[PDB]
Specification:
2 copies of one chain form a homodimer.
Chain A lengths: L1 H22 L12 E9 L8 E4 L1 H14 L4 E9 L5 E12 L7 E14 L2 E8 L3 H6 L10
Parallel strand pairs in A: 1-6
Antiparallel strand pairs in A: 1-2, 3-4, 4-5, 5-6
């Protein structure tokens, strides 16, 4: 019907934003927050602490980009696979990401990981982005030792 | 067209198998391998070692279920969300999973995690299942200490 039209319009536009998000590099990273809703949330759902580190609101998201550009100066996402779903406001992306890791008083390291990203949209802006990676890989990249599960 | 018909037939059937997989509990777990192709692969893509622990072939998958039923005796998946994609032979599932963890010479613990599952199908059987979780949560459940990233 007409709901169809809006939902199909929805999907195709939303996809473009996912694409745009995934290809954002360099200083453009400082304006990627403009792709969210005002109230929008982005962050890392897989942490050493077991709680998500979420950043809520387009302005805290812009602020976070400075720290991100500082700590991951050359970060690129590669091997991008975008998954549309039965919900036109929900997408998943499977990819890789690599670049230097510059933590303060840890040595410069090279960080690579496998990531899954969830994007939910509201009115054609990102209402919720979430990323999922294996925190062990980061521990490694910082010269932090990873415990062995002996199965 | 006709390709349409086969792809739509594809999706609806495939979904039923995802559902069936996700609801498999108890001793039924010993026959869940029958949902794969002969050549089929299942396993854990997020590990402490950084390599996937994959089990290849319906018979090694059946064998693995014994160890699984032994080590996670009451395991249930909850909060199941199944994502169909633009590819009718590819599905993602977001869920939780919890149950007891019985590792040999580690104490019995209670293990909970957040999981993402990828299912790819070939001729209506699972050609590749992959799961993604945060290994830190398991380390915890075994009284293994988790290192702190101090960001």
């Amino acid at each position: 019907t007409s709901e169809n039209r809006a939902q199909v319009a929805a999907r195709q536009h939303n996809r473009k934003i996912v694409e745009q998000y995934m290809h954002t590099r360099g200083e453009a990273r400082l304006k990627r927050h403009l792709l969210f809703t005002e109230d929008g949330v982005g962050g890392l759902w897989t942490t050493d602490s077991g709680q998500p580190i979420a950043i809520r609101g387009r302005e805290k998201l812009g602020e976070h980009a400075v720290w991100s550009l500082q700590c991951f100066p050359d970060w690129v996402w590669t091997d991008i696979q975008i998954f549309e779903t039965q919900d036109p406001n929900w997408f998943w992306v499977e990819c890789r990401g690599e670049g230097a890791i510059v933590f303060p008083g840890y040595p410069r390291g090279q960080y690579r990981n496998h990531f899954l990203h969830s994007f939910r949209f509201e009115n054609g802006l990102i209402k919720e982005q979430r990323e999922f990676m294996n925190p062990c890989e980061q521990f490694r990249s910082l010269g932090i030792e990873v415990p062995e599960v002996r199965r």
